[PDB]
Amino acid sequence: MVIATIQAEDHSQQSGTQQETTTDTGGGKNVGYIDAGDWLSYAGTPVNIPSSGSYLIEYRVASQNGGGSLTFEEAGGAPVHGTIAIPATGGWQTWTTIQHTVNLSAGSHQFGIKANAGGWNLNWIRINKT
Ligand SMILES: [Ca+2]
Numbered sequence: 580m581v582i583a584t585i586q587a588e589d590h591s592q593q594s595g596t597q598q599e600t601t602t603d604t605g606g607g608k609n610v611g612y613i614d615a616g617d618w619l620s621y622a623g624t625p626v627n628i629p630s631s632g633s634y635l636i637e638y639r640v641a642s643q644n645g646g647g648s649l650t651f652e653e654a655g656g657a658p659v660h661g662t663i664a665i666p667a668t669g670g671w672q673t674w675t676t677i678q679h680t681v682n683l684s685a686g687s688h689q690f691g692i693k694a695n696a697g698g699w700n701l702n703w704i705r706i707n708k709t
């Protein structure tokens with residue numbers, strides 16, 4: 580089942596981005612103005628991983644032109660858990676959920692996201708058991 584849902588805007592620190600209203604299901608806000616080098620820290624909300632192993636990480640994303648990518652990691656940069664390409668979705672508020680698997684150690688994690696290439700918006704992230 581679901582370990583955590585983290586709204587992207589609920590970061591404890593960030594660099595290079597700005598919040599904006601989203602018209603995705605549920606409304607609220609998304610993170611926008613994402614470019615290479617920009618990042619989001621969720622260190623203020625540690626997430627508990629119950630056992631070491633494979634977890635599915637989902638990202639709710641929108642992208643006009645595609646070309647984006649991110650790195651999912653611990654806040655601060657290391658260890659890195661995984662990377663994912665962000666596809667074109669049709670528009671800045673046309674939303675889809677993408678996913679990948681990563682290995683995570685058991686215990687408390689402070690997650691972060693680094694943008695390797697921009698061109699996308701982020702509504703929320705979800706961590707799931709496999
Ligand atoms: Ca930016």
Ligand SMILES: [Ca+2]
Nearest residue numbers: 586587608702
């Ligand atoms: Ca959101």
